[PDB]
Amino acid sequence: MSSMRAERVGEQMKKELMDIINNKVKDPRVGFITITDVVLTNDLSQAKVFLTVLGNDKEVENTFKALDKAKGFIKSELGSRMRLRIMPELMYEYDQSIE
């Protein structure tokens, strides 16, 4: 479940998503939102977006809801930055790997 195409598109989405989310979606009263990786399926139909977010357990959960609420806005801004015709479905995941 990782062709070279999928890895390359994921690096572009990582960069584009971090910009979109931090400069246009995020409440200024919360810290930066770090995207550590974007992992796509080979047909690019799904993207798992791994995240580092700052705060307590409820600030983490408040942040996930804001991003889910903004999914239409985020796919649209992403689609306007990439020749890709149909956007993947975006799934926001906490990055367990990091303590």
Author numbering: 1 to 99
What wording appears in the published article?
The crystal structure of S. aureus RbfA consists of three α-helices and three β-strands in an α1-β1-β2-α2-α3-β3 order characteristic of RbfA homologs and other proteins with KH-domain (type II) organization. Three α-helices are located opposite three antiparallel β-strands, with the following amino acid composition: α1 (4–25), β1 (34–40), β2 (46–52), α2 (57–69), α3 (71–81), and β3 (89–94). The α2 and α3 helices are located at an angle (~120°) with strongly conserved Ala70 at the kink. This is the helix–kink–helix motif (hkh) of the KH-domain (the GXXG motif is presented by AXG in RbfA). Pairwise structure alignment of S. aureus RbfA with known structures of homologs revealed a high structural similarity with Cα-RMSD of 1.24 Å, 0.82 Å, 0.82 Å, 3.32 Å, and 1.22 Å for E. coli, T. thermophilus, H. influenzae, M. pneumonia, and T. maritima, respectively. RbfA consists mostly of hydrophobic amino acids, which form the hydrophobic core of the molecule between α-helices and the β-sheet. Analysis of the electrostatic surface potential map (at pH = 7.5, as this pH is favorable for ribosomes) revealed a negatively charged region covering the area between α2 and β3 towards β1 via the top of β3 followed by the C-terminus. The positively charged region goes along the outer side of α2 to an interhelical kink. The strong positively charged region is formed in between the α2/β3, β1/β2 linkers, and the N-terminus of the α1-helix. These features of RbfA organization ensure formation of an extensive interface for interacting with the 16S rRNA core of the 30S subunit.
One such assembly factor involved in small ribosomal subunit maturation is the ribosomal binding factor A (RbfA). In general, RbfA is a small, compact, single-domain protein with a molecular weight of 13–15 kDa. RbfA proteins have a KH-domain-(type II)-like fold which is characteristic of RNA- and ssDNA-binding proteins. The RbfA facilitates the correct folding of the functional core of rRNA and is required for 30S maturation and translation initiation.
